[PDB]
Each structure stands twice: as C-alpha cells, then as structure tokens.
Amino acid sequence: EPIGEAPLPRLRLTDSGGKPLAFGLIDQPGESVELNYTCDQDICELVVHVDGTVYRLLVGINAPNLREVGSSVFLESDLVTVGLAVDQIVGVDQRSENFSVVGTLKLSWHDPKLGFSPDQCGCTVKSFEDASIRAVAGEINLPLPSFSFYNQQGNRWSQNQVIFVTPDGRASYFERFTVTLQAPDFDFLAYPFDRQKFSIKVDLAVPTNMFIFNEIERFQQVVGDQLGEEEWVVTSYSQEITEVPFERGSTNSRFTTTLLVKRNLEYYILRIFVPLFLIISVSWVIFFLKDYGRQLEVASGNLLVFVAFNFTISGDLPRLGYLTVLDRFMIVSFCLTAIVVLISVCQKRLGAVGKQAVAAQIDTWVLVIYPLVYSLYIIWVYLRFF
C-alpha cells in the first residue's frame, strides 16, 4: 500500500533460480495489491520482485486476517558490518599529493550456511589464514564480500588475514595493511596557514543486490594516540556510508573515513620568517648613512639573495597553477627592491650637478615608504584569513 500519492508498482513472486510461480492481481480500490501462493515442494525458496522501472510493502507468513514487526524476522540477511582504525601515519608527500597509513579492518556478517556441529572438530571456533581462505568457499560455492580501496595508488602490503567462524554462522574477518592513498582536496591558497582534509574510502566489489554495508562499528579507537608525523595534528574525524553509481544499472556500497589536519608553524617561523625579516630590516637601516652608491650596493646584493630564497621555497610544492600567500610576499619584496636601486642611481647622478636639496629631501621620503608598505600588505592578509 503506497504511503500517499504514489503510483502502484509491479510485483511478482518467482523462484530463486528465476522461474516464476505467482503474480499479483489488484482490485478496484487500487490502494493495495494482493499476491497469494502456497508451496507443495520439499524446499520453497522465494523471491519478491518489486518493479518500478518511497513505498510501503507488507510480507507475511501464515497470516489469515492479516488486515489490522512480528515475533521474528521473515527475510534473510546479507548486511555487512564494517570498522576501520588508524595506527600510524607513515608519511605525507605534499608535492605528489599522497599519504600513507597503517591500519586494521573488520568485516563481519551472518550466513546460515558454513555452519558446523561441534562434533566434526571437537572445537568451537575455526580459523583460516593467508591464502588458504581462497581454498575454502569455492567448494561450498557461497558468495563472500570483496572490498577495494578506491583511491589507492600502487600496492597494498597486508601482513595478516584471518577469519573466525562460529557454528551458528557468524564470521569475522580481520586484516592489517599498509597502503598509500591519494589526497585530491589539497588547497594551498592559504599556505602555510591551511587546514586540509584526508579521506580513506573503502568500496565493495559486488553489486548492491548481492551485498551492502549496513552499520558502522568501532571495535577500536579510530585514531591512535601516537602516530608520528609531528608536522600535522588531527583535530576531528568522521565515518559515514553512502551509495555511488556504476556501469548503467549497478550500484555498490561505500564507507568513508575523513581526518582533518592543521600545520605546525615552528619550522616555517624559524627558517624563513626570521632570516627574511633581518635582511630587510638592515637594508632599511643603512639608509641613514648618506654614503650613496653603498645604498645601491646593498640593494643589488639583496636582489641576488631573494632569487635564492625563491628557489628554496618552491622546492617542496607542486608546480602550482595559482598564487599562494608566501609567493605574494616575495613578489612584493622583489618589485620594491628594484625601485630603490632606481632611486639610488638617480640620487647619485642628481648630486653631481649640485642639487643636493632634492637628494637629501628625497632621501627621507624612502625612509617612510619602505616600512609603511609592508605593514599595509600585512593588513590585506589579516582580513582574508583571520
């Protein structure tokens, strides 16, 4: 019976092999459909097709006067429980946009097959490991889930695989891996004051009708206490399950773990910001000395130094397609310092004629523009990030 204002869909009861057994005949009211069948064989495995190529559907067993959530369930199970945890962060590679983790995986589900009495072994749990796992189910011919790290580059070194089976049917699959993943949301526009995010995506290799992900279970802490990688610090995390499309009419489950990180600034403040502040300051304090040409000599040398600091900073970033913050600061200082040499070369010639009054007066002008500009530029950076 549709919830409300939803067209009646097609329904059909067939056999698990595919042969049809019964069909649904609707009545004049049109708000409900009816299907009835009674088995007469030794095994009756039934499948309910609902065709629409939201709605409410009721299924019962031995329910005369079903008109007007029973004691037990009446549909099978293929719902897979998942769980992932992070133990280490081996490294981070800014320039190639990837990172690596060492974690562990837990897949567990229910199957009425693969059960066993405690008389065959005298034991209560059975264990398989390594590549013997591929040497079990094929003889029994029962479908197993198969995952895949969607955004993995290269190989995945998994050092242990184990599945424990309990007689009633429960099976728990564990795995320990070391993988390299891809991070495509790196945004350097605020470098080095940025907070990027890292994702781990686990995907099923089988369609939705054969398996899905159902619930998220944390058998362990998601983020371990010690990971290494002091340059990045984790502040949050999240886990969720979605559904992504494939092919033309097939979809599969997916399970995403996200980490949010921030960058420490103790290295950058010490190798770059301190040497750059000192060299600029002294190149402004020499302006007090009226020894001209020496003003040129120091400013020429600063041109040589900066192109060194330009190659250093570019060493550990991709060949980007836009402008960072650190790249804007160095462009400003490049252009500004090639202007003071112009003034110094103009001041030198201008003082040869005898018009020192312009030279002395214009000298004090560059004494205020130089320290004012950088303060102006900083203000333009305060608003766009803080």
Place this chain on the structure above:
Amino acid sequence: AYPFDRQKFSIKVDLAVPTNMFIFNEIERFQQVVGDQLGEEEWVVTSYSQEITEVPFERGSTNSRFTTTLLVKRNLEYYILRIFVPLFLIISVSWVIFFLKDYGRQLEVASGNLLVFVAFNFTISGDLPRLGYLTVLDRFMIVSFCLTAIVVLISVCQKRLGAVGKQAVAAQIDTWVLVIYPLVYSLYIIWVYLRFF
C-alpha cells in the same frame, strides 16, 4: 636535547589469536640478544630488556605481547667537527676585527655573517623532521642571529655619530661591545649546563 639525546627503540611481537587459544609463557634466550658487530657507528647500545604483557582488543578479547627494548646514545665526533668548529671560528674572528677602528668595515663583516648563518640554518634543518618545538641547536643559532643584527645597528650609529665630531662617544661605546659580545655566549652556555648535565 639534540644532539645530546639518548632515545630508545622497541620491537613488539604480538599474537594474532585470543588468550584462551594461546598465550606467551616464558622468555628463552637461545642466543645473544645483541650481536657483537651491527654496523651503524653513529648509535651505540648500552642496555636491553625483554618482557611480556597483556594488551586489550575488540570488546572481550586479549592477546599476548612480547617486547624487546634497546637504549642508544649518539656519538659527537661528526657534530663537533662539521658544525661546532666552523661556527666557533667565524664568530671569533668577527669579534677580533673589532680592535681595528676602521668603521664600516665593522658593518661589512657583520653583514656577511648574516648571509653565512642562513646557510648554516638550512644545513642543520636538512636531517630533522619539520619539528613542532625548539631543540638546543636551534636556540644557539637564534641567539647569534639576533645578536649580530644589533652590532650592525651600532656600527651604522657609530659611523654617523663620528661625522659630527663626537668621537668620544664612538671610542667609549666601541669598548662596550668589546665586552658584551664574549660575555653573552658564556652566559648562554651556563643556561644549557643546568638543563642537561
């Protein structure tokens, strides 16, 4: 405490099955734990230990674990020769030129030392992680950075101050920087003796 530190290394062996199915019981040394020759002359082992503990898992399952630990220390023959000798010499000579009253030359040498240090800053950072705090070697280089950009200020003040004719201030203040420079570094060393030795 870099490079005066003594870190420790662990090897952890863990069981992949619950406690009720297997455990570790005793520790047996069928061989010497640490072989005589290992290579890696930069680190030297002074002790070792072995122990067995029990760590939790899942919700109601625990497994055995067996830990081996090594304690190591760093040799200082490389660091004393590539860094401490070149840095002591360049600072000493930049203080002994102060005897010459040729001003501006005091600026010229101090300006060059600013250029050299930023080279020594990138060299030392080459083989350390992008750390989140301050080592010892990083404090020593910060002190010398800040101090040397102060003597250029004095030299540029001394040069202009001697043009008017007041050499008495210039000569008298010249001897002041002759005592502050070698006194400070000795003060800084004392602050390092207490925190590590």
